[PDB]
Amino acid sequence: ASPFRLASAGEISEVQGILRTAGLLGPEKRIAYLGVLDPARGAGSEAEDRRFRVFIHDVSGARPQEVTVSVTNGTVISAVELDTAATGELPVLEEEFEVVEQLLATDERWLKALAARNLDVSKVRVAPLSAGVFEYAEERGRRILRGLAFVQDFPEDSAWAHPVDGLVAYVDVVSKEVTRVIDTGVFPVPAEHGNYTDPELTGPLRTTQKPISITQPEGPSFTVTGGNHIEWEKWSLDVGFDVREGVVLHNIAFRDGDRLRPIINRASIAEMVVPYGDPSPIRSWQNYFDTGEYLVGQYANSLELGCDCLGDITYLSPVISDAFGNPREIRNGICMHEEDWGILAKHSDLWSGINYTRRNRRMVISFFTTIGNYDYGFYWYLYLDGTIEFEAKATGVVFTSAFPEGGSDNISQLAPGLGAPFHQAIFSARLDMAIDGFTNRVEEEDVVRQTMGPGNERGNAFSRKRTVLTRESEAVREADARTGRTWIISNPESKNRLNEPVGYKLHAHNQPTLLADPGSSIARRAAFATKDLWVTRYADDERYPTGDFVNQHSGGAGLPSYIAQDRDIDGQDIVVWHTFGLTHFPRVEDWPIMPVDTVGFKLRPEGFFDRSPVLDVPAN
Amino acid sequence: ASPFRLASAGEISEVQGILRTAGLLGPEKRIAYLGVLDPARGAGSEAEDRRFRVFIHDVSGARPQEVTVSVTNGTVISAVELDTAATGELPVLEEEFEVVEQLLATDERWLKALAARNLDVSKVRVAPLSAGVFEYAEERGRRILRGLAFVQDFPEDSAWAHPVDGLVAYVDVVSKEVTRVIDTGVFPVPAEHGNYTDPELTGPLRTTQKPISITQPEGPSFTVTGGNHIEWEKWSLDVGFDVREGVVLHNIAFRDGDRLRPIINRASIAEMVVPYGDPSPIRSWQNYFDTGEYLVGQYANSLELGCDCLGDITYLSPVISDAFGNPREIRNGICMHEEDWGILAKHSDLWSGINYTRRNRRMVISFFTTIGNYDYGFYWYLYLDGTIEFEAKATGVVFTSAFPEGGSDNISQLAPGLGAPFHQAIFSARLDMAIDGFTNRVEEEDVVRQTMGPGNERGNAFSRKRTVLTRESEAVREADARTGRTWIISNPESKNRLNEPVGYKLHAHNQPTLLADPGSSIARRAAFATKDLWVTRYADDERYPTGDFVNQHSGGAGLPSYIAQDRDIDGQDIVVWHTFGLTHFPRVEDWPIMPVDTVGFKLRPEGFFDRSPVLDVPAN
Ligand SMILES: [Cu+2]
Ligand SMILES: [Cu+2]
Ligand SMILES: [Cu+2]
Ligand SMILES: [Cu+2]
C-alpha cells in the first residue's frame, strides 16, 4: 500500500531470510541496525519498492557490512564491507553492554581497586558507555566500551547514588579483554541512598491530589488509515518509526480548500549528543550519542495508559529487529491523541458588539526512551493554526560522581559527598522541506533597528531584513536572540493572493550550543552542535548530521562534509538541520530523580495561507 | 479576615461616601483610578488598616488629586493636588474616549476629509488613542486623545478592515475641542470585509472536531479560603486584583515539610507597552500603555465556562469602581483551576528493576482583557516541582492602515490595499522577592567556556560564573542567550543542607527588547523596555516601571529614576523587574483575526529544597 507504512514483522523476517539466503547472515552475524528506506525522490521505485538498510556486525572480528535489501523483489541491491577504523564502528549492540561488568569481575586490577575501597565486587554495578575517539591508539578498529562503577547495596537500590570515583576500565567487547583499568585514587563512595520509592525518603505520600478525568465521548477527531496515516483538522501525514531516530514524520501537508498543500516532506531528530563537562580523567571521554551510537528507538518504553498517556490515546506498536534479524514489537511505544490547547482566537469588538472566542487543539505524537540513567520523551505537535512544534522532555536519574572536597567548577553537589558533573543535551532536527512542493529556499530574517533622522524623525521606526542563503557555503548559521533572528523557508514559485512567496518561519529557543573547545574530540565529532542552523541540498545519502557511523568515529563525515559541496539551495529541494539543546548544571532538586525539563523549536506559517486558516473552526 | 483579601463592593461604596463627605467627590469629579493598598512593612501592628488609593479627575480642567482613604477608620488619610504637566496626566476615562468620535462629526475639517474620500460620517468610527508627548507645546497640561478613522459599513461589520489612512485628529477631551485635523493625502480605503462571523468569509464550518471532556469527579485539589487564599499542593498564596495591573499574586510560599517558606512576596505585570514602528506622522505617535494609560483590569472580560475556561473552574469576581465611586463587579473575571501537565518524573531502571513514573500538574490563575482592537490573556502557573511561570497570550484584530503603493519597510500587507504596521508588545513583571524571607540578593549567572590545556587537556570542560549585583547602579542587566545567561535570587543567610544559600533561577525567553531609537520619546517614556532585568531596593512608592501617571508623561519616570538612588541590593529587601515581549511583523494569517501568540518567563528553584520536593507525589 502506502510506501510510508510502518515496517511489519513479516518484512523484517523476510529481510532476515534474504540476508541469510545471500549468505550475509550466518551464526557469527549480528544486526546492529535495520530500518526501512524512504521511497526515492522522483521515480526511483516503480509500483512500491520497499527497501531496508542493514548494518551487519561479525562477533568473530570480521569486517562488518552495510547492506540494502529489496524486501519486495527478494534481492540484495548492495552489500559493501566497512573499514571501521576509517568510517566508524557500528552502533553498540545490546549484548556488548552486559559483557563489561562480567569481564571486570574477574580482573585482578579491577578487583584490587575494589578491595582498596572495601567494596564487594558482587555489589558493584558497571555503567558501560561509548568510548569515543581519544589518544588510545590500540583502540582504532576495535569495539571498546568504558565502564564506571556504582555500588548497589541491595536489589532495589539505585546504584547511581553511590558512584565509585577515581576508577574507570576500558573493555574490548569483541575480544573480551579488559584493555585498561585506571585508578586515580580512592574517593569515599557516597553513602546516602537515593531510593525515591522508599517511604523513609519519600515520607508519607500526598493524599491531596484529586482526580482529573480527560475524556473524548465520541472518540478522537483524527483518523488512522493504512496503519500510520493520520488525518486531523486539515493536517495529513504518516507516522514512521526507525530504530535509530525513533518517531519520524513523513508528508506533512495541510488541506487548504480543494488542495492538499505539502509543508514538510520528512522530520526527525537525526542526532542527539550528551557531552559531559567534568575534566576528570575518569569522565572527560564521556559523550552519549544517543541517536547515533545507542539508537534511541531501540530503547523506547512501553507506555502505560493513565500513566504516560492520559486521554483517548491511539497507540502504535512499532516493530524493530533484534540482533538476529528476528522482529520484536515495542508494544504501545508510540502515543497519538489530540489535546485541548486553550484559546485559539478571541476578540470582543465594541463597534460591532460581536464577541468571538475559539479554542485551540493540538495533535500529539510521542514516545519515551531510556538510555541508562536517563529517560527522554520526544513530542511532535500539530496545531489547528498551521504551527508545527517539537518538544524534548529530559528526566531520569542524573549521572553522578564523588563531590571533590574543596568543591568543583565542573561538578555540582547533590548530597553529602555526591557530585553531578555538568553536561549538555543537544539535538538536531532534520527537516526535509517541501513548502508547497520541493522548490524551496531559506532566508535569514533579522530585526532591523532604524536611526532617528530624515524619514524617521520621531525615531520609532523599526524594520526587518531577509537574506536568501543561496549556496551551502552560506547556509551554516548561528542564532541571534538579540536581533530576533529567525529563518523562513519559502517556495519562490508559489505565491499567496498578495503576490508573495508562501513560507514557514522557524522559531528557535536560542539556547547555548556546544560549549567544548573547538579543537576537542567532541567538537569534531559533534560539529553539528556548534551551530544553530545548517541548510543543505537534498541528497539520498545525507541522512544524519554525524554521518551513518558515529560509534568511535572521528570527524570527517556529517554536515561539515555535506556543506563543502557548496550546492545551490536557492529555489531547490532543500533540507534544514536545526541544533537545539539544554545545558545542565545539576541542582539539588534534580536528585534523587530529576523533574522533567524541556527544549525544542516550532515553525509557523508565514504568508502560506491567504488569510487565517482557522476561520471555519466551530464555536461548538 | 486576611489583609490581602479582595476589595468588597461595600469597601468601594465606603470609599465613595468617605470621599463625598470630605468634598472630594463633586459633580465634575471622576474616579480615574481606585485600588486597595497592600499592608506595608510592619505586621506587628495587627490592627488591620484597609486603605484605598484614588486618583480623582476634574472634568472642568481643575487640578486632579491623589487621595488615600482608610476604609476601616472611615477617614481620608491624605489628599494631594497633582501638577499633571509635571507628574503626567491621570489615566484616560472610558467616557473621554467616546467624546472624540462625537466631536469630530461636526468638525468641518473632519467632514471635508471624509467628503474628499466620499465616506459617510455616520459610518466613520474613531479609535481614540493616547497622545504620548511629542513636539506639540500646547499639549503640556492638556489631556489629548488622537483619533484614527475606520469605516464600518454596517453594525455587524468589522471596521478594522477599513482604515482611512492619511488622516488623524487631535482632541482636547476636557475642553471638548478638536485641536487638529491632519490630512496627509487620500489613501484608498481597503474594500474587503474581514467579518470572521460571516459564512461568506468563513465558508462552511468544520464538523470534524469531537468533544474533549475535562472533569474532576471529586473536585479540584486546591482550596480557596478567605475568598482569595489558595492552597494547592504545598503552595499557598493570595490572589489579588487591581484595576491597573489585573491579577496580582501575594505571599507565594511553599510548605517544605513543617516550615512554610516564602518565595515571592508580590508578583504582577506592572506595565505593558505596545510601540508601533510605522514612521508615518499618521501613526508615529502611536504607543499603547495598556496597564499605565488604559488600566487592563478595567477591561477584563467575563470568562464563560466551556469557552474561555475548560474543566473544573473556580471563578473570582473582582469588583472595581466606575468613574463615580460605584462598585462594578467583573463577574467571572478570574479563572482558577489545576490542569494536567504530562510527565513529572520518569525512570525505568535496569539494575533495580523499578519503573517509576509520575504525572505533573500546574495551578492556573488567569484573566483576559480587551483594549480596542487587541485582546490579551494573563496566566500565572504554579507547578508541583516548585516552578513559577507567567504567560501572556495575544490575540484580537490587528491595528490596520492602508498598504502604500510601492510597498513599505514598516508595514505588512494583509489584504488587497490593507496594511498592518510593525509594532511590539513588551511587558514588565514586578517580582517583590522573598526567598525564605526578605534578605535576598541577585547574581547574574553565565555559562563559561574553557580553553583546552592543563586541567582541560581534552577540551571538554565548561563551567559557569555568578556575579552578585550589589548596588542598583549595577542591576540594569541585558540578556545573553548565547552564554545561557540567567539570574538567581538567593537568601545569603538561609543555607540548604549542603550549606549553600537557597535560591530561585529566572529563565527569560531572550526576545528583543525596545527597538525604538534610543533618543525617541517612547525610549524615554518606556525605558524599562530597553533592558531585560532591573533590580531595585524595595520602596512602597516604587510600584511601576513607568511611574504612577504614565499618560502624557515626559520621560525617565519609573525604573531609571528608582535605579538612580543606587541603593544596596546585596542581601536586602529587593524587587526584580523583568522586561519581555513580542516583536510583531503581521502575517497574512493574522487577518482577519489573529490566532494566539505567546511570551513569558519562569523561575525554578536553585537549591531551595534539600532534594526534589516531589518525592511524595503518589503514583495515582
Ligand atoms: Cu543505596
Ligand atoms: Cu542533564
Ligand atoms: Cu467591511
Ligand atoms: Cu501584534
Side-chain angles (χ1 to χ4, degrees), chain A residues 461-538:
Chain A
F462 73 76
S463 192
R464 84 219 286 200
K465 71 175 173 184
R466 287 166 175 178
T467 317
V468 184
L469 308 176
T470 63
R471 295 198 87 87
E472 288 173 323
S473 52
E474 305 164 353
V476 188
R477 327 297 299 197
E478 66 174 4
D480 199 357
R482 188 157 297 153
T483 67
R485 180 170 294 164
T486 63
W487 298 274
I488 292 173
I489 303 95
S490 53
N491 179 329
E493 295 185 349
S494 193
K495 305 191 172 186
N496 53 34
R497 69 192 189 89
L498 308 186
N499 201 213
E500 292 281 88
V502 299
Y504 257 74
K505 179 186 287 201
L506 171 67
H507 287 102
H509 295 188
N510 305 316
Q511 293 278 163
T513 43
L514 195 82
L515 301 170
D517 191 276
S520 63
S521 170
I522 193 57
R524 305 303 190 182
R525 297 181 59 218
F528 75 86
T530 64
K531 286 290 173 284
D532 300 83
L533 196 97
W534 303 68
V535 188
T536 57
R537 177 58 175 282
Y538 169 85

Side-chain angles (χ1 to χ4, degrees), chain B residues 374 423 584 594:
Chain B
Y374 277 154
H423 59 274
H584 198 200
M594 118 176 221

Side-chain angles (χ1 to χ4, degrees), chain A residues 125-126 136 152 155 160 192 196 202 204-206 208-219 221 233 276-279 284-285 301 307-308 310 340 343-349 351-352 354 356-357 359 361 368 372-373 375 384 395-397 409-410 413-416 423 447 449-452 455 458-464 479 481-482 497-498 510 512 515-517 520 585 587-589 591-593 595-596 604-605 607-613 615-616, chain B residues 126 135-136 152 155-157 160 192 196 202 204-206 208-216 218-219 221 233-234 276-279 284-285 301 307-308 310 340 343-344 346-349 351-352 356 359 361 370 372-373 375 384 395-396 409-410 413-414 416 422-423 447 449-452 455 458-464 479 481-482 484 497-498 510 512 515-518 520 585 587-589 591 593 595-596 604-605 607-613 615-616 618 620:
Chain A
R125 299 293 75 83
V126 170
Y136 309 120
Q152 187 183 5
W160 308 104
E192 202 187 279
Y196 46 79
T202 61
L205 303 188
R206 276 133 92 133
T208 59
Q209 301 196 0
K210 268 66 158 56
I212 298 176
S213 175
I214 302 185
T215 301
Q216 286 214 73
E218 305 174 40
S221 328
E233 302 296 312
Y276 278 71
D278 179 2
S284 49
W285 52 267
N301 300 161
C307 303
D308 303 274
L310 190 57
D340 181 85
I343 299 297
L344 173 65
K346 191 173 178 59
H347 183 65
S348 298
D349 198 64
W351 299 331
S352 73
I354 301 175
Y356 175 101
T357 304
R359 286 204 77 87
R361 319 234 286 206
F368 230 91
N373 50 302
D375 308 71
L384 299 172
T395 180
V397 184
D409 291 338
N410 302 281
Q413 181 167 31
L414 305 165
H423 52 285
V447 166
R449 294 186 67 199
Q450 299 175 239
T451 312
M452 191 170 85
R458 284 184 179 162
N460 69 113
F462 73 76
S463 192
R464 84 219 286 200
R482 188 157 297 153
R497 69 192 189 89
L498 308 186
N510 305 316
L515 301 170
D517 191 276
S520 63
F585 299 98
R587 65 191 181 131
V588 189
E589 286 89 359
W591 185 255
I593 190 174
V596 159
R604 300 215 311 149
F608 188 78
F609 304 95
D610 285 338
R611 59 191 58 80
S612 162
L615 302 184
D616 63 336
Chain B
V126 174
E135 60 290 301
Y136 310 129
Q152 178 182 4
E156 300 303 85
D157 192 57
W160 307 103
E192 58 175 76
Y196 38 84
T202 65
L205 261 38
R206 286 175 200 197
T208 55
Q209 315 201 339
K210 303 273 183 281
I212 296 174
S213 312
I214 295 188
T215 61
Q216 297 213 252
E218 290 165 21
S221 325
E233 300 297 306
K234 298 177 167 196
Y276 281 73
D278 187 347
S284 48
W285 49 266
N301 297 334
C307 305
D308 299 304
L310 198 44
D340 179 88
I343 303 316
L344 176 55
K346 189 174 178 60
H347 183 43
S348 296
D349 199 57
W351 303 332
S352 57
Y356 174 95
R359 298 292 289 182
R361 278 176 183 211
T370 298
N373 50 296
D375 302 56
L384 292 179
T395 177
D409 293 337
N410 311 97
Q413 181 173 17
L414 300 174
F422 301 168
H423 59 274
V447 157
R449 295 185 66 192
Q450 309 184 55
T451 302
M452 180 165 80
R458 276 180 192 169
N460 70 122
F462 71 74
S463 205
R464 82 221 285 203
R482 196 153 286 144
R497 78 176 182 110
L498 302 179
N510 294 320
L515 300 173
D517 179 290
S520 70
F585 300 110
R587 70 187 175 143
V588 181
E589 35 282 287
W591 189 251
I593 173 176
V596 162
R604 306 181 86 232
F608 192 71
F609 304 97
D610 287 334
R611 61 191 59 81
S612 166
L615 303 170
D616 58 355
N620 272 307

